[PDB]
Amino acid sequence: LRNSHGYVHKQRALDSDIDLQTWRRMRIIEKRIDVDKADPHRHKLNH
Amino acid sequence: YEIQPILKGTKRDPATRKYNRAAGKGPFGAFPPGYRFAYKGTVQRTGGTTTSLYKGRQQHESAVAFTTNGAGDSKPPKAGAFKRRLIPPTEFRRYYDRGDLPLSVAHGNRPTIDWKVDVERLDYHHYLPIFFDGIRETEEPYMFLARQGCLDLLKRGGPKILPTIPQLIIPIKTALNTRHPEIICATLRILQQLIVSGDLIGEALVPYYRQILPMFNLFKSRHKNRARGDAIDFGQRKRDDVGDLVIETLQLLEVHGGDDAYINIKYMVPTYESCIF
Amino acid sequence: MFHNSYQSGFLSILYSIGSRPLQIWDTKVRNGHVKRITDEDIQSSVLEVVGNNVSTCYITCPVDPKKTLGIKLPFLVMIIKNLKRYFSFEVTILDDKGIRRRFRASNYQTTTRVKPFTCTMPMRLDEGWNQIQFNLADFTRRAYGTNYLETLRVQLHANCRVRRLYFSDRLYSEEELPPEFKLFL
Amino acid sequence: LSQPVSYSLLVLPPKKELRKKGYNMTDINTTSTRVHPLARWQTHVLKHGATYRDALDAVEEANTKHWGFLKARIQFSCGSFESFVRTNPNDPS
Amino acid sequence: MVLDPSGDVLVGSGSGEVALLSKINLTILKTVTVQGSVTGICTVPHGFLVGTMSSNVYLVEGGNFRAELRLTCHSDTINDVVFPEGLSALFATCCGPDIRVWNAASSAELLRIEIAGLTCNCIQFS
Amino acid sequence: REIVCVQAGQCGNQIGSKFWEVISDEHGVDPTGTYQGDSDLQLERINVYFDEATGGRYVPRSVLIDLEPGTMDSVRAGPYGQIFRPDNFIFGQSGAGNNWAKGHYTEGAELIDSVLDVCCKEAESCDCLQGFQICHSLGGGTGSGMGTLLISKLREQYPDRIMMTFSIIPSPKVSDTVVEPYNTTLSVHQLVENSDESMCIDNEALYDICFRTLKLTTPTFGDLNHLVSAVVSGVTCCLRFPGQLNSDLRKLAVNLVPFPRLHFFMMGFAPLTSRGSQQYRGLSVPELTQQMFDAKNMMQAADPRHGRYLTASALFRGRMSTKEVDEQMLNVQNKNSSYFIEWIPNNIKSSVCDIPPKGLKMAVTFIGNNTCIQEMFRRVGEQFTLMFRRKAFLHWYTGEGMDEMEFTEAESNMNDLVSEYQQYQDATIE
Amino acid sequence: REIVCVQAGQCGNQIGSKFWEVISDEHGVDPTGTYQGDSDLQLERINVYFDEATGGRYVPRSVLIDLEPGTMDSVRAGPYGQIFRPDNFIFGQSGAGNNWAKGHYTEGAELIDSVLDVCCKEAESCDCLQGFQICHSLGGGTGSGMGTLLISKLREQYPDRIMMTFSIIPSPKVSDTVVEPYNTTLSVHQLVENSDESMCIDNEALYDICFRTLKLTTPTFGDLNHLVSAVVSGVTCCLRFPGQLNSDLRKLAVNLVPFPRLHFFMMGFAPLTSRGSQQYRGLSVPELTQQMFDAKNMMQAADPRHGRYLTASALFRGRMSTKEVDEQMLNVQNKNSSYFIEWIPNNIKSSVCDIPPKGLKMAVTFIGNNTCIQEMFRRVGEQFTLMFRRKAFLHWYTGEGMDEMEFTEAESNMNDLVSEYQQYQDATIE
């Protein structure tokens, strides 16, 4: 449910047990409790 | 009704009884056997009269050391680094009571040990560790006999003292661990006597700083000089100051130790300063 | 303080013998102690200033920080025994240009440094008992190029045994000193 | 029967601050029941073993502690209280 | 030497200090200092009374041993008494090294002059 | 300005469950704890009853205490039970047995330190603390004993706050427990010293509310506890919403209590009306005032016609003019002047709040201080004297350890309270 | 700056297996050795623990030593076991017999040369060598004896590098082995001379962590080894990821150890919390600090309330503010000031790292140097003195060849360690 840098992804996780409402809850909570407006290590992610 | 005298610091002290359980007996051994919820009124009636000048009196009870409210005025218990400890039993007492020792006390204004056999022929391997084991005693006549015999044996010994050094470390360490300041002073004085009594002894004691010197660190700051400022102390003759004794003993150990005693002493006591370089 | 006194020959303000040796001195002692003890080498009473921190434990003169000694004699002589440890002392003087200057000597200094307020210098002590003769006028002339008028503060730091501190108007030989000033082994 | 539980104190600010704000040092004595505009109430908690005697001792200690003090109040657990005042203002004892 | 109702012993010293000693091991529990050598200890249901050689009588409370003074008297031959010119509410007396001024209506005293080691003989008002 | 609630015993826990349902509904909190409300006005004062948890969640500032967990297990299993913080449930291992001495002395002192620890943890977390609110019955065992124990401890620890209680009291006609007079007398003795303001409810009065006013065919304890939850949430409504004339628990106490022992009040709530009748009467301030003073709508067995009002307070919810409120309170005081104590020039305080409860156009809650409460205490004291002369069931209480002097003191103090009410009822200017 | 790991004995091999699972997961290495990670930050410091093989594969710089191959066959069969280089498994042909003297003198000197050859081959391959890391138990036989032998040899060959150990120590309540006091005393004697830093863990503390905090119904050694792998991987985190305030093993040693013998530390790890409770409390710096200092969560039997802190260290992982860290560590130091040694003005060092452990938003590991460790050594010395005075099992050790004087030396050295701790606890400013 999280990447290496500790963020909560964007899209639905495959075979996830939680519903969409709790996913939106977790996303908004994590955006509330962040200390910076963006990840300072975005450029080092690969896919 | 009954009265209880203070009875402290006197001829009859129960303090000296708890330590060294073997003491207290006569010249011979022990004698043969045969010789609810009561009402207390209305304490408070403040209801209906609340006001801002009131504030809480109870404020719960006690405090936990690492809770949210805090530790309050609580303090941890003392470890007792300076608390006096029990004196282990000594081989000197057994050998003296049994009757194998060739010395006896000669009374007088300056006490002196009368020796029934010439000292130079004694087997120091058997005797020197036994006498150092008697330094720990705190009851007459064991104290004077043991310590004066130690001094006499060291003074007249000669070249045979040197191989005895490995056997003397345990009595030296056990004397210092008792945390009795007078025993510490006697041990330090005898150590000062031992260091210079012969040759190549200081170099032999360098590997054994790991066992002796730990007790030096604890007592290097204790001082009896309670006089204020420039007042002189008239009890200097007794040499009962622990700190001066331990400092001068450390300096003597450095001087007679040899090439690399300083690093070992520095590793044992941290606040030391070199006396040579 | 000594401004209105008679100042000629020898003027001494410290002496271990007496009812109140530290009468005109103030003590600032932490992690240390000061006391009067009998010395083994010379068999007489001496003062001892010993502490774990050199800077913290010291004795000053005069007691009130706003007072000045006002002594015009050029030389300062000390009687100090070295204990193979750290030791330092200070003297504050006044020149004819009206500037208060300090002279600090310590046995662990490496290089001499001269500044408009301070001149730090190394100092070495021989084994046993030592007498240190200090020339304020020569040091002032050599350091600042300015004449010397008076001293107005004396300090002493741990660790060192002391018997007497006195001023003199010139150097004296061993036999020219009065008996009470000369030390005997 | 009842025992004291707290004591209340009314004090004035220090003399230099009172002069800085602009209020006169004198003319504090008056026959009216009203108080100075800068007098503040503070309260303290007594311990369990406290009685009338040591509470009064604490009040006297507060009286001799600092300048700018004429009012006192000792509160009991029954809700009652009594007041202590200086007979002569700006004069202790 | 006077015993309290509880059983403890009171003491009085020549320096003027009053202490309370325990009946078990004779250790100090409470102490008060008053002026004058203590000669006489009394017992009252709410406190104690202490009398001194300088004719001072104090009243102390057994709760926590605080002292207050209610008596002032001379202790030697009184030499002279005078009145001021035109005033009668107060008068001055001399005795030993002391000069005192009393209030005639209430028998109180508010003044004292002491020169130790001397004797006053005659006093007059300007 | 936040209140902390305590619920004790079976009655207290059951009433509390309905109260927290009503409060969660008014602020739009889902039983999962998620905010689902429909106006910002709901959120901006949510702190008054809820504490804020980190994520999407809210937690209620309440301590639950009981001696056997059966009630707690039933409420925790209920539909809103999840909202409560698990650490807030404090319980023992054996019941109070409806005995005051057991509840006060043996298991009370065993639990009370853990209850005080939870109450202190909750209190010291507040940025500014308002009074405590406690619900319990007086006839029970753990409710009476541990409630009054905790009240006494909180009054020692927080003497400057307000202490408010809601309390259930024995009906005059049928007992629910054989030993009610002892437990009631001892609890009233404790309360009159400790409490600042106390409201009393008879289950018999709620039965008469249900049968006469709402004409319910098959009422259940959920309805009685809903009526109670309605009045309790109504008294505090002005604390937590805007209005034209704000009011506060301390200001209510200052206006209601003339003397510190006279702090026992009657309660009522007005827009009660049967499903058949609502077509016959539109809401208006005169109608609310008429229901407000009708003894049919009052939650105690004593009737106002045998006593006099010292003071009363009315809190109005809804959009309304101040002129009709003021003039209605004047007209009621003028028309019924013999029932109002004459040495007070105006007995009624009014307050107005803009936001009514959902689905009602307007509402008022009524609090009344009337001397007719003395007859209830007189009846309880009579039954106590009847039981004590014969030492009725006394061995249980004496076997736990109580001194009989406690019983004689509590009876004497309550008897002096009835006498004091009777003297002020018949007082005159002269 | 690369570390070489050594795992010795059964406990060491199992903890090592769980550690290398945790580390391979954190850097996204498949158990086949293929990199499958999702950020460059994972790759850029892989050298610290891994050596590079030619194709996909990476190999971990670790030596496994044991006297009977049963454990090695179990770890090779484990889920990450395949990753280990076959030549790195060193084993003998007969067991340690749970005897320290046997493990140190007879099979130790027989095997040690092949272990030293492997350790040198691994060390001399590094471009710059950082400290060694060793895992073993002190109560066992080959773990204690051969581990301390190898430590002494490595300290002879690399005296300027760092030597770090994690060590398992006997519980105060139940023994797993009868001869534990001898093996523990001799091992502590070896460690206090040879080691730079030694961490001690009680299995009893891990059981209490699991049962009270995690509420596991049936915990297993896999859970205990996960807790250990968590702290072990936390200490090294600043070596291998970026951060706002970098830290290093040497900087930890320099700030934690006031004097060279006082290098034994207690451990804890903070964000432990049950799945049921997690919904009620979000992670934040106050919560982590409060849990971090609660003695319930600390991994030693000694309790801080009986001692005083000389120094402490906290390593934080995650994106977080420095202000909150500084003000919390100040507030904790101020409120409990009697439990902190007064001749050091601030006892706690902080450090902050950007990259948390996978699946946690934030974490902290705590290292503490506390005098209450003296109680453990005193207890071990007591049990040793009870056995030695009676020669309880000494003939086994003497038959291997040990002189009795070694036991008295080791006892004396531990007793002096206890005395030194006691003296520094009661020191004062004067």
Ligand SMILES: Nc1nc2c(ncn2[C@@H]2O[C@H](COP(=O)(O)OP(=O)(O)O)[C@@H](O)[C@H]2O)c(=O)[nH]1
């Ligand atoms: N109104 C109301 N009264 C109740 C409720 N539950 C119990 N009671 C009453 O409270 C009294 C019993 O007290 P109880 O709560 O059992 O005391 P406890 O055993 O100490 O908890 C009886 O008069 C019951 O009728 C309830 O939910 N609502």
Ligand SMILES: Nc1nc2c(ncn2[C@@H]2O[C@H](COP(=O)(O)OP(=O)(O)O)[C@@H](O)[C@H]2O)c(=O)[nH]1
């Ligand atoms: N924490 C932990 N302790 C263990 C583990 N395996 C064994 N122990 C403990 O270590 C001690 C046994 O030592 P052992 O490793 O068998 O010594 P060896 O025979 O020399 O390898 C006992 O106290 C066991 O409880 C493990 O996986 N984790």
